[PDB]
Structure 1
Amino acid sequence: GHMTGAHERTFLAVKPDGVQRRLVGEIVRRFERKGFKLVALKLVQASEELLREHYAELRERPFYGRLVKYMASGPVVAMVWQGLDVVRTSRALIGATNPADAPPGTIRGDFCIEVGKNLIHGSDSVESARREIALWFRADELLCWEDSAGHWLYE
């Protein structure tokens, strides 16, 4: 928002490769240790229809069909994290979309190799986040809770 910005939210999804390679906890832990507030979480198998909409911007790219099929092929961990500048900061935490360009210390820099098996998706902007959160979650899945760590993360 514009109050303090602290209620900004982003959508993050661990892709099937992240689940298969047993990196869910590792990924969650990095967001937790950063100070962000987990406000929604579910393991789902996403429909192709949802994924087509999710990735509509990429519909003209040659990998689009396989991306959609692959993301529909197995479990995904869908999440919403909340905090100041969470959208941009989460993109920084995960690293460049192509792991080859993601420095060590980022999730993709540390844990994967190839752009099509890049572990995670994070919203690229506040507007994309609003759209992605709405697409993947119902409103009643976004939890309001009193974060005891807020005091130590925010001035």
Structure 2
Amino acid sequence: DHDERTFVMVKPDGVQRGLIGDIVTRLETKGLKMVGGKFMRIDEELAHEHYAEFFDGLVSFITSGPVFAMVWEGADATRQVRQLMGATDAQDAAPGTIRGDYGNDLGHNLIHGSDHEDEGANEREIALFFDDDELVDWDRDASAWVYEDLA
């Protein structure tokens, strides 16, 4: 079912390079539905909770400028976004994908999408970055043509 959600973040390199609209439209175009978005700075203390799993370089980077955090909704949202991003290392990512098209590095890899193979990391990572009041429930009319949900 189509209420599944995932967490997607455009990282400081994305935001610095002016790629947020680019990332947003590839997810829109795919038919996924935005339920949360905010342009925020991440504090060392929040970085520490996220990457609680080179640790102090990936903190220095996730905290080096503004991020644009998002929640995205739709069928198999977590897999779909993670297919769309291509391999985490943008140097091995396939052309067509976000990292394969805009990226040329491991640490500055444009974005984060929750991992579909670490179960629940989708709900863990949205609880961490958003509260239930920064999240919207609405019906995207065009989802009737995105899926058998149709007239």
Paired residue for 2:128?
Answer: 135
Q: Deviations over 1:64-122 (max 9, x none)?
A: 10111111121000000000000011000011100122100000000010001101000
Aligned to 1:111: 102
Normalising by structure 2, what TM-score? Answer: 0.94
State the Cα RMSD in Å: 0.8
Query: What is the aligned partner in structure 1 of residue 58 from structure 2?
Result: 67
SS in 2 for 1:102: coil
Q: For residue 90 of structure 1, give the secondary structure of its aligned residue in structure 2.
A: helix
Distance 2:56 2:127 in 1: 23
What is the alpha-carbon distance in structure 1 between the residues aligned to residue 79 and residue 144 of structure 2? 22
**SS of 1:40 mapped into structure 2:** strand
Q: Secondary structure at the match of 1:148?
A: coil
CA distance in 2, matches of 1:50, 1:134: 12
Count of residue correspondences: 146
Structure 1 gaps of 5+ residues are 58-62
**Identity rate, percent:** 55
More helix by share: 1
Alignment of 1:120 onto 2:111: yes
Query: Would you say 1:40 and 2:36 are equivalent positions?
Result: yes
Query: Pick from 78, 83, 97: which aligns with 2:69?
Result: 78
Structure 2 counterpart of 1:50: 46
Query: Which residues in structure 2 correspond to 1:18-29 (within 5 Å)?
Result: 18-29=14-25
- Cross-structure match for 1:6: 2
| Structure 1 residue ranges, 4+ long, deviating more than 4 angstroms after superposition | none
Partner of residue 13, structure 2: 17
Give deviations 1:4-25, integer Å, cap 9, x for gaps.
x200000000000000000000
SS in 1 for 2:15: helix
